[PDB]
Amino acid sequence: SNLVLYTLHLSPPCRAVELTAKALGLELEQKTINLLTGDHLKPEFVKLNPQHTIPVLDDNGTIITESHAIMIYLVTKYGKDDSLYPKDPVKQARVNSALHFESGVLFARMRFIFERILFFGKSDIPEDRVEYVQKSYELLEDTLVDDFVAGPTMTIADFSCISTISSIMGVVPLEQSKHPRIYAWIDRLKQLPYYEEANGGGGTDLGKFVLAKKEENAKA
Amino acid sequence: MSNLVLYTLHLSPPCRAVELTAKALGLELEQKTINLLTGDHLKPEFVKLNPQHTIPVLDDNGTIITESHAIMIYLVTKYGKDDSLYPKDPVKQARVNSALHFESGVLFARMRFIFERILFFGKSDIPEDRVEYVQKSYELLEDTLVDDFVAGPTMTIADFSCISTISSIMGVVPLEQSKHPRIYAWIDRLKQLPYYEEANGGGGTDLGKFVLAKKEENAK
Numbered sequence: 255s256n257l258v259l260y261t262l263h264l265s266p267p268c269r270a271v272e273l274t275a276k277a278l279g280l281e282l283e284q285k286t287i288n289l290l291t292g293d294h295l296k297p298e299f300v301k302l303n304p305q306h307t308i309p310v311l312d313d314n315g316t317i318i319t320e321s322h323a324i325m326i327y328l329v330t331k332y333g334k335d336d337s338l339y340p341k342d343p344v345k346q347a348r349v350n351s352a353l354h355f356e357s358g359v360l361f362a363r364m365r366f367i368f369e370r371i372l373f374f375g376k377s378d379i380p381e382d383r384v385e386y387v388q389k390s391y392e393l394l395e396d397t398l399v400d401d402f403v404a405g406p407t408m409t410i411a412d413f414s415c416i417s418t419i420s421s422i423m424g425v426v427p428l429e430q431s432k433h434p435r436i437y438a439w440i441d442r443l444k445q446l447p448y449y450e451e452a453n454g455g456g457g458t459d460l461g462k463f464v465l466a467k468k469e470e471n472a473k474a
Numbered sequence: 475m476s477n478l479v480l481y482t483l484h485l486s487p488p489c490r491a492v493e494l495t496a497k498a499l500g501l502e503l504e505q506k507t508i509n510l511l512t513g514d515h516l517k518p519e520f521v522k523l524n525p526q527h528t529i530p531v532l533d534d535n536g537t538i539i540t541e542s543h544a545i546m547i548y549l550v551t552k553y554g555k556d557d558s559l560y561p562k563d564p565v566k567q568a569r570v571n572s573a574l575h576f577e578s579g580v581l582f583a584r585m586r587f588i589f590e591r592i593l594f595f596g597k598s599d600i601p602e603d604r605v606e607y608v609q610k611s612y613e614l615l616e617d618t619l620v621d622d623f624v625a626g627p628t629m630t631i632a633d634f635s636c637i638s639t640i641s642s643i644m645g646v647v648p649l650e651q652s653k654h655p656r657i658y659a660w661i662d663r664l665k666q667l668p669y670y671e672e673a674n675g676g677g678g679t680d681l682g683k684f685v686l687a688k689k690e691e692n693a694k
């Protein structure tokens with residue numbers, strides 16, 4: 255049976271998994287979990303993930319939660335080689351470090367900005383949020399000593415990072431002159447034949463939605 | 475070959491996560507102090523070593539690994555007599571990986587959102603939204619603890635990551651017993667480890683106390 259992803263295209267971690275599936279040549283059956291209408295808080299979803307977050311993978315009855323765990327699981331089970339997630343302990347350590355940089359820094363700080371606008375009716379992006387996000391950009395820039403986030407080769411860590419960066423750059427400005435490594439890295443990822451469908455459109459659209467929601471919230 | 479070297483500060487939660495892991499693996503760590511409180515992490519030589527200027531950093535005979543979760547996985551992978559602390563079964567490992575990213579993306583990130591502004595930016599308050607964010611993280615952890623440990627019936631590195639953070643934040647944003655019976659029973663299990671207090675418990679308590687003292691010093 256097909257792999258099932260419980261998902262929403264606007265969600266960055268969902269798009270990270272979509273990029274990974276495209277890279278692996280996997281077809282995902284996508285089941286919408288609409289966060290705006292509280293689909294993730296329904297008992298039938300909470301049973302799949304006590305943390306009530308998307309994405310969640312159902313692989314023939316086996317439930318895997320959390321985008322990074324899902325990506326590692328998919329590469330491990332379905333990869334024809336380990337290029338996207340190395341088995342070598344030292345190469346893997348660099349990828350693992352970057353995956354946690356994404357969850358702990360990039361995504362967390364994006365969510366600290368977006369959640370309150372999308373779900374709590376806020377009409378601002380406080381100075382401290384802006385500062386945190388700008389610092390996350392600096393940290394990513396300084397991490398990009400090689401062409402990709404975890405070395406000379408593209409890995410799942412790049413998919414995680416771009417899913418988030420492509421979303422927040424539309425809201426908290428990512429100054430081109432100050433982040434040449436990030437922009438050059440974005441250009442590399444944009445060369446992927448599946449980049450637009452798996453990530454680019456949804457990242458751009460999430461940023462636009464946050465800006466629209468901020469305006470709506472300011473008015474009422 | 476050389477003893478493992480950790481650039482570290484006992485007060486730091488991710489450093490204590492690594493300390494717990496080394497104790498569990500029966501490994502000696504040569505600790506080199508990087509005092510964040512005096513800006514040691516920003517000296518040119520350390521930044522060259524870790525462009526993100528965070529601790530912990532492992533030096534294993536010239537191999538440099540940043541990021542506590544990556545360090546823990548590397549240590550178990552290379553030096554574990556068995557893989558109990560970080561399983562190789564894809565599904566069991568996915569459960570651990572999911573919990574590790576919950577720790578970095580939720581528990582740790584929200585603790586840092588509370589602590590950093592006090593410890594380093596001269597702030598003297600804990601905004602209500604920070605308290606709520608942290609309380610939510612406790613609820614998410616409680617709901618994740620369906621088994622004896624965070625990622626299943628066996629203690630793993632995910633437990634060490636989680637407790638290092640929980641033991642720190644609970645002294646500032648109270649983690650109330652009636653609401654979190656699973657967390658308290660889990661803490662009791664970890665407290666049965668002979669090395670728990672030394673590797674983690676006291677340091678977590680001390681960080682919470684230091685945050686409260688700094689908050690008061692920062693006032694007016």
Ligand SMILES: N[C@@H](CCC(=O)N[C@@H](CS)C(=O)NCC(=O)O)C(=O)O
Pocket residue numbers: 265266267289294305306307308309319320321322357575576579
């Ligand atoms: N570390 C998780 C983060 C998942 C996450 O926070 N997803 C958001 C959507 S972007 C969500 O489901 N939020 C709903 C909630 O937290 O209740 C992952 O990468 O899968």
Ligand SMILES: N[C@@H](CCC(=O)N[C@@H](CS)C(=O)NCC(=O)O)C(=O)O
Pocket residue numbers: 354355358486487488510515526527528529530540541542543578
């Ligand atoms: N995900 C990282 C977090 C590391 C981290 O943020 N450590 C803090 C101390 S708790 C630090 O070094 N802060 C200094 C800085 O970010 O400049 C890990 O687990 O190693």
